[PDB]
Amino acid sequence: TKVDEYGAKDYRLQMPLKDDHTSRPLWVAPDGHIFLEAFSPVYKYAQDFLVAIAEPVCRPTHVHEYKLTAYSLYAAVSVGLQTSDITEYLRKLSKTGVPDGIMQFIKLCTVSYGKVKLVLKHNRYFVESCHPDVIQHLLQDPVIRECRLRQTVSFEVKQEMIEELQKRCIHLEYPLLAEYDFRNDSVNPDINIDLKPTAVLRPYQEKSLRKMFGNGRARSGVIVLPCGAGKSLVGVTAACTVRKRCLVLGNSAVSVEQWKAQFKMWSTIDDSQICRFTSDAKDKPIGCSVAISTYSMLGHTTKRSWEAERVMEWLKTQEWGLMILDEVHTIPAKMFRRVLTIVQAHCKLGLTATLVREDDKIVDLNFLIGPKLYEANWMELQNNGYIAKVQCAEVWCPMSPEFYREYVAIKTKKRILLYTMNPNKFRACQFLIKFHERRNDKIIVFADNVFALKEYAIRLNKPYIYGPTSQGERMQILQNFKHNPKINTIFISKVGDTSFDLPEANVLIQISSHGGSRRQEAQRLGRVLRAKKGMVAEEYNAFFYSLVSQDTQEMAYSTKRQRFLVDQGYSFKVITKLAGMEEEDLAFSTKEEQQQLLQKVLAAT
Amino acid sequence: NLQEFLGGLSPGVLDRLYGHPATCLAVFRELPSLAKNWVMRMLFLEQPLPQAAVALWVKKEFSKAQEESTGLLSGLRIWHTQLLILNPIFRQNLRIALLGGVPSLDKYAEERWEVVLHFMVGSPSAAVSQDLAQLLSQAGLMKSTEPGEPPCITSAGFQFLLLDTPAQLWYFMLQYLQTAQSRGMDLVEILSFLFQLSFSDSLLNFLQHLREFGLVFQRKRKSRRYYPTRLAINQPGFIVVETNYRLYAYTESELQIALIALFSEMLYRFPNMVVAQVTRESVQQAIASGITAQQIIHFLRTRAHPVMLKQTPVLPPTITDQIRLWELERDRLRFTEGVLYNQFLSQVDFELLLAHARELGVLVFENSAKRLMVVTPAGHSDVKRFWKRQ
């Protein structure tokens, strides 16, 4: 609240300093921001405690940055950490005390939890509460009455208005409890699903699963893990532990196929007990319990086929012990979020690897599913070797004179097609691909503009893939990339970042970017995180190049796009010039070729 | 350096400056490697010796040391060829110099220099001294232009501020001597005191200025005896740099926070720590003020916390490269005053004018294909006179 002569806020008169400040490695700002030291001997204990009570926002190598909020404190209480149980240790760890503001915030957030519980039974959602005064003073506004369908006091609530009531309670200061007591539940018989000994659970996966199952009752929340970290394995383990009917929701055909494959591989459950509620192919969804389907199908708004209508009615009628949702970052979308209310589930677990978006709808996930239970430390995984170390780099390509002339001259938005296609970046990508091809490194080129992708691919006679590409040709190209030594590069379009199971690649070049999309950036980066059989963290075997054009909007987009990666800790090294480019022969070495490319770009319209 | 300062002097001032008490020893210590040996050798000789002996008195290997030492001491004029006997006065003084004839102080020096730097920066609270203010203003690192308003800081001021304490103080004292000559204070008398430290009205004023700078402290209501501080004769870091352009500095003295804010955006200030961000805005603001990326990088490196010393390099390559690129972008467009030519009837005349401009140094850039060139306005008069002369 107090501002120094500079931008930073003043806290000299706010909180004191502990005498043993050197011993205490923890800081506590009044706003809730906490700065932990990664060099302290008690760093591991401090990391565990701060991860338990707060969500990371920036975890560089030296000083980690966390911030705590109501959702994080509710998650702490869910895993069973009381207000004293957290605040006493926070004061002990803190080297400068705990401000009264944070003290009162923690007290209020902890006490305002568990008073209101939401439990669904016999397809009816009852808002139970041991304390009656909570309901007595919660029925002040008329929205609750119009919502409600027309000790331990409970009342039934309308299915459709659950989301509205929950978001209302979040700001009403009475969060709802979504804990599932699968251990004590006789209404829905347990499913015959077990985890085979073959599956191996990594320490971070076990920690995330523990945070989810803080107690005997499963907690509904979101667990963010890298795509290569085995989030599918974590979800399968969660379903197996729940031992009740599980509905997994993918985002595409590839996602549902991969989910079924993961289920069969890691769970002893028989093949016949798993169904694919997919329009392309179905396996009698009503027949078995464990189901894998898609947001599009479940939330489909237009006319429903007869068989799909029967399946949807069966799904609505039945109650699901677990609702797994992969790629939760798309949930807050209208149709996708409608699925949450369409289907009934005790706990809706969420898994993803890039929980970031521009529109401020990510905060809605906290109530749509639950608080962010776990968020894996990418740097720690890199050190442990679970994830391949990546030498993140941004190659700056000077824009050609003429191309810059038209780009600046035109105030329209042909620049997206223009700066994405310039001779300098073309030569840079050609030289980089040549260098990695002679180094036997697998290349996955990326480009949002299909026009630019096709031009580059024809000029380099490479197998570009894109949306309306035939499925058979797509599979053939992927198989050739994985097996045929003569080919070691594939030019994938935006379809690549959506969902796929691609072979591990040693390099990932990105000539063009869709925009300031942290989601796309992280999604494409996750492709090369696949750990090799015997690599090492310090070898930096994996490389990521994000080619950008100097003095163009692409620079702003790249800077706005690398925010999530830098927050994780990756250091994007800038490369102004590439050694050997002048000696190496590359296309567009004369003014004329650039001229024809510019003419084609202009005629593109 | 002191070697430069002493080399930039005349023989008449040099021999006088070679005072008996200390100068012959202070200048001796300057002798890097070998000239010490030769000075000791021919300290006891009253007969000059041929130059060929000195030439051949060093082996073939490492002769460049011999030539450089001989040139340096010829510039110092310790001896004369006399045809290489040393100066009689220097010989006598050196023979007389060779068998012939605190914890609170360092803190005081630190505090005084810190308050001086606080005044140098726009600190509302600082020590007030009109003589110090005018001395800094005339030192070339500060300009007021309005006595009523406090003086501001010039471009050189920020560069001086970001320098390390040793070099900062040394340059400040160099400027002090240069301005002492201008104001009329005898240079030799004040200079000899500095040499004597490492072992009149003008003397009293000079000692007062040194005490204001914090190098000395009488401690006895300005008595004749003085106890020089450590800085008179001539530390761990505290900043931690992340990979996201974030600085965590364990700073309690406001001077360090001000120095960091000069080129970073401050976010939080804890009792024993402060958080800042190195953004384009702050870095380009510093560059426009006059700093260059080298000073910022050196400052962060010297004030580097022990935690980041283990990693090599200490400062992350991404941070260093980003700072350098930010400074470069500002000077992408290089401005240079000049005068253009047009309508060259014949290329022979243009080539002759180009040769003349190259000889005189007037030319700045030339274009043979377009038959044109650019000349600075200073050389514009010369080239115009040449054209008039035809």
């Binding site: 780099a393 800038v574 | 260093t320």
Partner: peptide
């Protein structure tokens, strides 16, 4: 063998 490229091993900025 399998050594990192020069432009990633050392800064390519002119400084």
């Amino acid at each position: 063998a399998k050594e990192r490229p020069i432009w990633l091993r050392e800064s390519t900025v002119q400084g």
